[PDB]
Amino acid sequence: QNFELQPKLKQVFGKGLIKAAMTTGAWIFTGGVNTGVIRHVGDALKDHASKS
Amino acid sequence: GLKLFITDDELKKVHDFEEQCIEEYFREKDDRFNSSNDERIRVTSE
Asked: Which residues contact A15 (CB under 8 A, 6 or more apart)?
């Protein structure tokens, strides 16, 4: 289901997840569809794609 | 001889190469702006 976390928690978690993804070429395993934590990961990667 | 009549598969390849170039250019404009001295001083003032 869809949810929402703290804003600073979302920002810190998203920035750290995208850095952990790009420093090592990791594969991220999500559930695919745009709901919940996969939506948060997609917003984190949308923040990723504008910067690095 | 001059122009290359090109197949689609390679038209797609030159197209998304050019997409890579335009996106990388605008990111390079952005970090030239945000690493320029003027912008650093403006954010440090506010």
From this structure: A44, A47
